[PDB]
Amino acid sequence: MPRVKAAQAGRQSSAKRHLAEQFAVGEIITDMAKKEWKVGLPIGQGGFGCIYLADMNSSESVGSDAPCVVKVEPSDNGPLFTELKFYQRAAKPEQIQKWIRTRKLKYLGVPKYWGSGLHDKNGKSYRFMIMDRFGSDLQKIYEANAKRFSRKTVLQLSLRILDILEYIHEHEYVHGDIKASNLLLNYKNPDQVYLVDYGLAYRYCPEGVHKEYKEDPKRCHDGTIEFTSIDAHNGVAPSRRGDLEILGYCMIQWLTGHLPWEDNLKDPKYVRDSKIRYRENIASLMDKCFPEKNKPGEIAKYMETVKLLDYTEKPLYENLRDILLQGLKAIGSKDDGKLDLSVVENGGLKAKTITKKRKK
């Protein structure tokens, strides 16, 4: 006997506001560069959260002080010291121009350092760091553009990632979880993407000593089990193979729309299984991930190549750079129209703390 039933609809809540009025707008703070930055509007969003925009004093012709934003971090220090130390050390106009030009690199995805300092407020010392003005994040763009990233989009994304991964991973740091929220687009220059959330920066080779992958005690996992791979999740510091592995996962993610172990992001066995399962026959699996009229050959060859270099036998990012660009150029694309991500959406995720040993 038939029965009729249906009662469930409507579930969306939106409630954010930013009016201070009393005390906030116009608070000038002098950083270590000896500039007194005038905070303007509370954005709240960014590669961390609670990020402010710099209004500054518009006397007559402001220099470069206006087009910047500032992250706020407690002086108790979580990711800040690691992030800022690298930030200030890497964001050096002189050095950037030099090594980028000489190493034939494309572009470093690191925000320009303007200033940074400490300001005790109400008895709580907050340390602030001034970065480039961000307005677009790949997390909200993921939603708004339905994660449809074309070859030229993914290629350009991974291209700049290759630049930065070599620069950072040649020294000491890693980044296990490559999340869409890690990539921030310049608010008024979308073709140039920056990376933040350096809390997922674990050290593999201290100073410059290539140790050995056995840092794994039981579990550490910097970031989500999604892109962190088996390596970082177990707690082991990955070599070039790790970074290459993670990048491959993000590339196929943007190219296909969704990861099999992401729909299964509720089970450690399935995520591990699926990753190993696909890596068994990378060429076959990658090409068969999105079979219709798509060309996933660049990824297939890339993945075969990265598996072919063992773990750190012969890792050459420029060689991977070559194959990817060669494939892209084969279909008639080469830095097509300066990226493809002009969605300019704002509403990503938050930054995370370093897995130094224990977070309780």
Swiss-Prot record:
ATP binds at residues 43-51, 71. The active site is at 177 (proton acceptor). GO terms for molecular function: ATP binding; histone binding; histone H2AX kinase activity; histone H3S10 kinase activity; histone H3T3 kinase activity; kinase activity; nucleosomal DNA binding; protein kinase activity. Pfam families: Pkinase (PF00069). Active in presence of Mn(2+), Mg(2+) and Zn(2+), but is not functional with Ca(2+) or Cu(2+). Has a higher affinity for Mn(2+) than for Mg(2+). RAN inhibits its autophosphorylation and its ability to phosphorylate histone H3. The modification Phosphoserine is found at residue 342. This is Serine/threonine-protein kinase VRK1. It comes from Homo sapiens.
